[PDB]
Design an enzyme around this catalytic site. Sequence first.
Site, PDB file in Angstrom:
ATOM      1  N   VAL A  56       0.817  -1.167   0.078  1.00 18.52           N
ATOM      2  CA  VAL A  56      -0.030   0.028  -0.002  1.00 18.52           C
ATOM      3  C   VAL A  56       0.871   1.020  -0.020  1.00 18.52           C
ATOM      4  O   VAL A  56       0.497   2.257  -0.394  1.00 18.52           O
ATOM      5  CB  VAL A  56      -1.071  -0.087   1.082  1.00 18.52           C
ATOM      6  N   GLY A  62       9.597   0.646   7.597  1.00 19.95           N
ATOM      7  CA  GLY A  62       9.032  -0.511   7.208  1.00 19.95           C
ATOM      8  C   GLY A  62       7.877  -0.236   6.231  1.00 19.95           C
ATOM      9  O   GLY A  62       7.514   0.836   5.673  1.00 19.95           O
ATOM     10  N   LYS A  79       1.590  -1.271   9.245  1.00 16.47           N
ATOM     11  CA  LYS A  79       3.159  -1.045   8.936  1.00 16.47           C
ATOM     12  C   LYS A  79       3.902  -2.018   9.907  1.00 16.47           C
ATOM     13  O   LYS A  79       3.679  -2.012  11.091  1.00 16.47           O
ATOM     14  CB  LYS A  79       3.391   0.359   9.289  1.00 16.47           C
ATOM     15  N   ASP A 165       8.496  14.353   9.816  1.00 20.65           N
ATOM     16  CA  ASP A 165       8.679  14.074   8.390  1.00 20.65           C
ATOM     17  C   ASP A 165       7.392  14.458   7.695  1.00 20.65           C
ATOM     18  O   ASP A 165       6.710  13.380   6.962  1.00 20.65           O
ATOM     19  CB  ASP A 165       9.088  12.492   8.030  1.00 20.65           C
TER      20      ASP A 165
HETATM   21  N1  LIG Z   1      -4.277   3.557   4.463  1.00 19.05           N
HETATM   22  C1  LIG Z   1      -3.470   3.672   3.952  1.00 19.05           C
HETATM   23  C2  LIG Z   1      -2.012   4.418   3.359  1.00 19.05           C
HETATM   24  C3  LIG Z   1      -1.938   4.667   1.820  1.00 19.05           C
HETATM   25  C4  LIG Z   1      -0.547   5.016   1.217  1.00 19.05           C
HETATM   26  C5  LIG Z   1       0.402   5.251   2.288  1.00 19.05           C
HETATM   27  C6  LIG Z   1       0.276   5.092   3.571  1.00 19.05           C
HETATM   28  C7  LIG Z   1       1.443   5.204   4.592  1.00 19.05           C
HETATM   29  C8  LIG Z   1       2.205   6.142   4.268  1.00 19.05           C
HETATM   30  S1  LIG Z   1       3.340   6.220   5.656  1.00 19.05           S
HETATM   31  C9  LIG Z   1       2.209   4.969   6.578  1.00 19.05           C
HETATM   32  N2  LIG Z   1       2.913   4.769   7.854  1.00 19.05           N
HETATM   33  C10 LIG Z   1       2.036   3.949   8.754  1.00 19.05           C
HETATM   34  C11 LIG Z   1       1.168   2.964   8.453  1.00 19.05           C
HETATM   35  C12 LIG Z   1       0.369   2.324   9.158  1.00 19.05           C
HETATM   36  F1  LIG Z   1      -0.523   0.976   8.855  1.00 19.05           F
HETATM   37  C13 LIG Z   1       0.657   2.360  10.569  1.00 19.05           C
HETATM   38  C14 LIG Z   1       1.778   3.281  10.858  1.00 19.05           C
HETATM   39  C15 LIG Z   1       2.403   3.993  10.072  1.00 19.05           C
HETATM   40  O1  LIG Z   1       3.383   4.707  10.380  1.00 19.05           O
HETATM   41  N3  LIG Z   1       1.436   4.801   5.754  1.00 19.05           N
HETATM   42  C16 LIG Z   1      -0.925   4.650   4.070  1.00 19.05           C
END
Ligand SMILES: N#Cc1cccc(-c2csc(Nc3cc(F)ccc3O)n2)c1
Length: 312
Positions: A56, A62, A79, A165
């Site tokens: 995704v 990660g 994540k 960030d």
């Molecule tokens: N839903 C969704 C989606 C779609 C595209 C990018 C991201 C994205 C970019 S950084 C990110 N970090 C993140 C995603 C988690 F599920 C849990 C902790 C996180 O820090 N997610 C999420």
Amino acid sequence: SGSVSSGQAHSLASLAKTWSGPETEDNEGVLLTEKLKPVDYEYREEVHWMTHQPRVGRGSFGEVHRMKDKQTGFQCAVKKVRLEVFRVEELVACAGLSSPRIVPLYGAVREGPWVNIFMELLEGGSLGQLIKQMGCLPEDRALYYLGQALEGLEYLHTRRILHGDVKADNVLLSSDGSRAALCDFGHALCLDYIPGTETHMAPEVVMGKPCDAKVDIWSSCCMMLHMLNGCHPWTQYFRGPLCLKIASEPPPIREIPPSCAPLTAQAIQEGLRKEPVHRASAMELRRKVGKALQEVGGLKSPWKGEYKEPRG
Ligand SMILES: N#Cc1cccc(-c2csc(Nc3cc(F)ccc3O)n2)c1
């Protein structure tokens, strides 16, 4: 055996601090929504939940995946982070916070040397993904999204939290494109800063000076240039390590498109003052961005449709 519980964000924060040898299968954590359910105090990948589909996205430390709870059928994002790179701040900084401009966490569960962080799934995708799809975004939509990101930053900054960030890849969009929200607090700091994405880093960051909330404002305006031009700042003018160039060159206001209206260019300039003392706050910049959006006629462009040529 495991010790995964259902509970509240403060309890998850306390446990996360204990996460900070031979690799185990220890299973512990806290789930924050009833839609993700421990089974007899366990919550293990492939047993109680599973990932599916292509990635995704990339997140701090990660990769991010779509996942499903096998029992409830609930779909969310996860994540997966190796324990040795996990930053506790990700699970502490937002404990007790709630804003439409911040994507909510659903919990986190450790399984041996892996921390799985669960979050609301937003089908609109990231702002980074939108820029790639569309080439670049028109001025009005860019101002609109920058404004919503800044609203999120106001919420954080008043609580002495640095996001750490701010970039398009970490801003998620609702299914219809109307709402944007910050996610990913892997680089967050409750006011040592662990620098984020090089192209978006402020001069005080590269100069190793005391960092504060103004770091996020510089980042947000680099994100603004990314939305407008279709590429990160610096990259189209410079070659190797960018750190010395960020510290030494003028701020990248030369990358503001000539087509931008005066208040738009002014807002970007104010968010890119090299000395953070002179740089706008989130509160200030959000107001300026709102006026800039009004001056170009408000939000009119449809969130997709017309590919716009990025700067070559
Ligand atoms: N839903 C969704 C989606 C779609 C595209 C990018 C991201 C994205 C970019 S950084 C990110 N970090 C993140 C995603 C988690 F599920 C849990 C902790 C996180 O820090 N997610 C999420």
